[PDB]
Design a protein around this ligand. Structure first.
Ligand SMILES: *[C@@H]1O[C@H](CO)[C@@H](O)[C@H](O)[C@H]1NC(C)=O
Ligand SMILES: *[C@@H]1O[C@H](CO)[C@@H](O)[C@H](O)[C@H]1NC(C)=O
Ligand SMILES: *[C@@H]1O[C@H](CO)[C@@H](O)[C@H](O)[C@H]1NC(C)=O
Lengths: 24, 80, 145
């Protein structure tokens, strides 16, 4: 079985869109 | 994601803190890229054997601003 | 021409081929079957000789024929050059570096002009390209170094 609880993601789930180095 | 095929997978492993779902920023790094090119509309999970997880979210096209670290990593991001 | 692997003394009748098929063969179709061709109106499959022939005959090969009868080895290549994710491509050629010099570079498909040298970047392992604030290619990772 499983539950269908709902929560808030807050700030999370950010990946690199590309593979291009960037600084500052 | 399956944009124009070209299946995309990103992963990152954090030992977590006393809580389960944190707020501290954590970048997501790519692992593999290969041309699947098949219809993907349904999603299912697999389990294990034994004798509070599987947090699932969805994505929408949004505009984001990301602060790139001097080393090239990501330190802070903000939704628009 | 393969007259050494498909030819030995005392003959060889290993290969087969079909001169008798009910119709033509559609593009890229294999019709491996042993069905005796019908002649006239007999449903004959027990009769072996007249008016009931085996569908396939032999390619009996020996080291001594004419050129037109030698066991030629034929391999055909079919490509699919359509709008699809490329999977098989040719042997792209690599060259030297020659640093501290104005050199035309063609790094992994990123072609340009300039002078290249060693850097002290902090490229992540997954990283391949480099840029700046104005989105102009700044640094490139050597794919073979
Ligand atoms: C989404 O979560 C927040 C708080 O966690 C709140 O807006 C609401 O409970 C949820 N919205 C739903 C379930 O539609
Ligand atoms: C599957 O994908 C193709 C193109 O990738 C599309 O033309 C087709 O409508 C899709 N079929 C679905 C989503 O059932
Ligand atoms: C590239 O391939 C050559 C040939 O095997 C090998 O000697 C060299 O170490 C390789 N270098 C890298 C960076 O993979």
């Amino acid at each position: 079985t499983t539950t269908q609880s709902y929560t808030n993601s807050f700030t999370r789930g950010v990946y690199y869109p590309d593979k291009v180095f960037r600084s500052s | 994601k399956n944009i124009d095929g070209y299946f995309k997978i990103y992963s990152k492993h954090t030992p977590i803190i006393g809580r389960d779902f944190p707020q501290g920023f954590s970048a997501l790094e790519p692992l593999v890229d290969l041309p699947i090119g098949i219809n993907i509309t349904r999603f299912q999970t697999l389990l294990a054997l034994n004798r509070a997880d599987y947090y699932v979210g969805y994505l929408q096209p949004r505009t984001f601003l990301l602060k790139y670290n001097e080393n090239g990593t990501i330190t802070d991001a903000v939704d628009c | 021409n393969s007259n050494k692997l498909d030819s030995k003394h005392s003959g060889n009748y290993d290969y087969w081929y079909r001169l008798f098929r009910k119709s033509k063969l559609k593009p890229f179709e294999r019709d491996i079957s042993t069905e005796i061709y019908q002649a006239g109106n007999k449903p004959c499959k027990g009769v072996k000789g007249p008016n009931c022939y085996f569908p396939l005959q032999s390619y009996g090969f020996r080291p001594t024929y004419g050129v037109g009868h030698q066991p030629y080895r034929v391999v055909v290549l079919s490509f699919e050059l359509l709008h699809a994710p490329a999977t098989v491509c040719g042997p792209k050629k690599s060259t030297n570096l020659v640093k501290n010099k104005c050199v035309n570079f063609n790094f992994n498909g990123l072609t340009g002009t300039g002078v290249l040298t060693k850097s002290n970047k902090k490229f992540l392992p997954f990283q391949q390209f480099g840029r700046d604030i104005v989105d102009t290619t700044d640094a490139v990772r050597d794919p073979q170094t």
